[PDB]
Design a binder for this molecule. Structure first.
Ligand SMILES: O=S(=O)(c1ccc(F)cc1)N1CCNCC1
Ligand SMILES: O=S(=O)(c1ccc(F)cc1)N1CCNCC1
Ligand SMILES: [Zn+2]
Ligand SMILES: [Zn+2]
Length: 582
C-alpha cells in the first residue's frame, strides 16, 4: 500500500499545496481516495468534408449521420478473489504458456532509439502535452532523458515518483511520455518481436491483417469438433484480477540482468499498484489508487489481454473436456492431469482459437464447452448479454462468426479462385470515414485522410459495390501525388502512393498463402463483388433512387471537390469500373 504509492501522492500534494483538501463528498466506493486539488478544462468528433461531399446519399441515413454527433460506473466496481482450485489452474496454465511463447523468442529491452523513431512516425502511445509541446520535442532534449534517468534509477531501487495515470464501454489512461518510455523499454518486446503472431502463439493474430483473419477462421472451422463460440466479456479491462496481474508478471521469470529488474518494477509499481488523476465537475482533480484492473499503455494492454484470454479459454476448454471436476480445490492428481493435458494437447487446443486481446473465437473438441462456465465466471470473465449460468450459443457456420468487429464472406472469382474477404455493416464503414479527430486540419490534410479511407476500401472492401465506387470517386477527387495520412495508426498496406491494383495483386494473390495459383489480375473488372442481395443484406444502397442518381452523376461530385481543392494534377479512376468505361 502507501509505501509504494505514497511518494507519487506526496509529490502531487506539493505541486498543488494552494488547493489540497481531503473532500468528504467523494463518489468512490471501490477506488481508495487520497485527496483533491483545483483544475479547469475538458475534443469532439469533427466531420471530414471531402468524404461527406462524395457520399451524399448517406446524408439522410441516421445510422451514418448520428455517428458524428455528441460506463465509469463499471470502473468503480470490484471483482471477487477466485477460489483456490481456479488460482492453481491459472498459475499452472500461465507458467506453461510463457514457456511455449518463449521457446523461439528472447525477451530484450527496447531502445531510446526505437522509442525516438516511434514518436517521429506517429504511433498512438497515449501520452500527455506541459514542459514540452509534443512528444517529438521532449525526445530531442537531453533534459527529458535526465528525468527518464532519474525515474529509471528509482525503479532499479524498487521505488516510483512520476508514473501516474490520467483517466478519460471505454476508459483510456494517458501517462507522461517518460513513464510510457520505461513501460516500452521493459515490455515493448512483446509487440516489437511479435510474441502474439499466429506462428509463435498459435491462438494469436498479432500482425496478421484484416485480409488474413477470415482465412484463419476458415482454417479453425476445418478442425473436427463442436460449434464455434465467440462470447464477448462484459468490460474485460475492469475484470482483470490481482491474480491475473501476478500470472502476467511471470514473463519476468524468462528475463535476466537490468531488464529483469526494470520489468519487475513496471509490474509491481505501476500495474499491481496504480495512482490515477480524474476530472470531476463538482472542475477539480481526484487522486485515487487501486491494485487491480487493467491500466497499461494500449499496446502492452493488447499483448497481456491476449495472454490472459488465451489462458482463460484453455481453462474453459479443460473444464468442458472433464480435466478437473471443481474450482473449489485442485487435488494432487488433477494438477498432474492438467499439466499432462497441456504437454499432450495444449498446442493443438491453442490452434482451435483466434484471440485478439479480449476478443476470441474458440472451436472446442465438442459442445460440452457451451455449459462449462464455473472457471470462466470464477476468474471474473463474465459473458456480456447472457445470464450467468445460461449455456453459450455457438455458430454453425464460420461465415456468420463475429471477430474484430467483422464477419467474413467466401467470394469466388470468375476464374474459379477463392477470396475470403472481411465485411461489416456498410453504414458503420461510411460513418467512420466521415469523421476526424483533433484541430488545425488543413484542406490538404483532410483530403489525404479521405484518401487513406478510400485506399483501405479498395483493398479490404472492394466487394461492396457502394465502397468500390466511393473509393474511386475520392481517389479521383484528391490530387494523384498527395500521400495518404492519419494522426493515429493490423497491417496498413493501403498507406502508400503505389497503384492500388498493384497493391491488391500483392496482398490477395502474390503474398496470400491460401492462393496456390499466382496468376496476376490485369484489371479491377476481374475482381468480384458479393451477390447483389448479400450486398444489400450488409447495408448496400443499390436499388435506391438516391444511390442511382449519385452513381450516374458522380463526375459532378468529383468536380465539386476538385474545384474546392483547386488547380492540381488529378487522375480519373472511374473508367476502372465497367459502367463508366464508355
Ligand atoms: O496536410 S498534410 O497532409 C501535407 C503533407 C505534405 C505537405 F507537403 C503539405 C501538407 N499534413 C501537414 C500537417 N501534418 C502532416 C500532414
Ligand atoms: O433481388 S433483390 O434482393 C435486389 C437487391 C438489389 C438490387 F440492386 C437488385 C435486386 N430484391 C428483389 C426485389 N425485392 C427487393 C429485393
Ligand atoms: Zn515510476
Ligand atoms: Zn457482409
Amino acid at each position: 500500500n502507501l509505501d509504494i504509492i505514497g511518494k507519487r501522492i506526496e509529490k502531487i500534494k506539493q505541486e498543488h499545496e494552494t488547493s489540497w483538501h481531503y473532500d468528504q463528498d467523494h463518489p468512490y466506493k471501490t477506488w481508495a481516495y487520497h485527496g483533491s486539488y483545483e483544475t479547469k478544462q475538458t475534443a469532439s468528433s469533427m466531420v471530414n468534408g471531402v468524404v461527406r461531399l462524395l457520399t451524399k446519399p448517406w446524408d439522410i441515413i441516421p445510422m451514418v449521420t448520428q455517428m458524428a454527433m455528441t460506463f465509469k460506473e463499471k470502473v468503480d466496481t470490484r471483482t471477487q478473489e477466485p477460489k483456490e482450485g481456479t488460482k492453481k489452474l491459472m498459475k499452472i496454465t500461465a507458467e506453461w504458456l510463457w514457456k511455449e511463447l518463449g521457446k523461439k523468442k528472447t525477451p530484450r529491452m527496447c531502445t531510446r532509439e526505437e522509442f525516438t523513431r516511434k514518436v517521429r512516425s506517429n504511433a498512438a502511445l497515449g501520452a500527455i502535452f506541459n514542459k514540452w509541446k509534443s512528444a517529438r520535442e521532449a525526445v530531442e532534449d537531453s533534459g527529458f532523458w535526465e528525468l527518464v534517468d532519474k525515474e529509471r534509477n528509482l525503479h532499479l531501487e524498487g521505488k516510483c515518483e512520476t508514473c501516474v495515470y490520467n483517466m478519460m464501454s471505454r476508459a483510456i489512461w494517458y501517462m507522461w511520455l517518460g513513464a510510457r518510455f520505461l513501460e516500452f523499454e521493459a515490455l515493448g518486446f512483446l509487440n516489437e518481436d511479435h510474441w502474439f503472431s499466429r506462428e509463435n502463439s498459435l491462438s494469436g493474430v498479432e500482425g496478421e491483417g484484416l485480409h488474413k483473419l477470415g482465412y484463419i477462421l476458415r482454417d479453425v472451422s476445418k478442425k473436427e469438433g463442436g460449434a464455434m463460440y465467440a462470447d464477448d466479456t462484459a468490460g474485460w479491462d475492469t475484470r482483470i484480477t490481482l491474480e491475473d496481474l501476478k500470472n502476467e508478471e511471470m514473463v519476468t521469470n524468462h528475463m535476466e540482468g537490468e531488464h529483469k529488474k526494470l520489468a519487475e518494477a513496471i509490474f509491481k509499481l505501476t500495474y499491481q499498484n496504480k495512482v490515477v488523476r480524474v476530472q470531476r465537475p463538482t472542475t477539480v482533480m481526484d487522486i485515487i489508487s487501486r491494485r487491480d484492473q487493467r491500466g497499461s499503455g494500449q499496446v502492452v494492454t493488447y499483448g497481456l489481454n491476449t495472454f490472459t484470454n488465451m489462458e482463460a479459454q484453455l481453462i474453459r476448454q479443460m473444464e468442458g473436456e472433464g480435466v478437473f471436476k471443481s474450482i473449489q480445490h485442485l487435488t494432487v492428481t488433477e494438477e498432474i492431469a492438467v499439466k499432462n493435458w497441456l504437454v499432450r494437447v495444449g498446442r493443438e487446443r491453442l490452434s482451435r482459437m483466434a484471440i485478439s486481446g479480449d476478443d476470441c473465437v474458440v472451436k472446442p473438441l465438442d459442445d460440452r464447452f457451451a455449459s462449462a462456465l464455473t472457471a470462466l465466471n470464477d476468474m471474473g470473465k463474465v459473458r456480456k448479454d447472457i445470464q450467468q449460468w445460461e449455456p453459450s450459443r455457438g455458430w454453425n457456420d464460420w461465415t456468420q462468426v463475429p471477430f474484430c468487429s467483422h464477419h467474413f464472406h467466401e467470394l469466388i472469382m470468375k476464374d474459379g479462385r477463392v477470396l475470403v474477404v472481411p465485411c461489416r455493416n456498410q453504414d458503420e464503414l461510411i460513418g467512420r470515414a466521415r469523421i476526424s479527430q483533433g484541430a488545425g486540419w488543413s484542406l490538404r490534410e483532410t483530403a489525404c485522410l479521405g484518401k487513406s479511407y478510400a485506399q483501405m476500401w479498395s483493398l479490404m472492401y472492394f466487394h461492396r459495390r457502394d465502397l468500390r465506387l466511393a473509393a474511386n470517386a475520392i481517389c479521383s477527387a484528391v490530387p494523384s501525388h498527395w500521400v495518404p495520412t492519419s494522426r493515429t495508426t493490423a497491417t496498413h498496406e493501403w498507406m502508400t502512393t503505389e497503384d492500388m491494383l498493384t497493391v491488391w495483386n500483392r496482398v490477395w494473390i502474390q503474398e496470400n498463402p491460401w492462393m496456390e495459383d499466382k496468376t496476376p489480375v490485369e484489371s479491377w473488372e476481374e475482381i468480384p463483388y458479393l451477390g447483389k442481395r448479400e450486398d444489400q443484406w450488409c447495408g448496400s444502397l443499390i436499388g435506391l433512387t438516391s444511390r442511382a442518381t449519385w452513381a450516374k452523376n458522380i463526375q459532378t461530385a468529383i468536380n465539386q471537390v476538385r474545384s474546392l481543392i483547386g488547380n492540381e494534377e488529378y487522375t480519373d479512376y472511374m473508367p476502372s469500373m465497367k459502367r463508366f468505361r464508355r
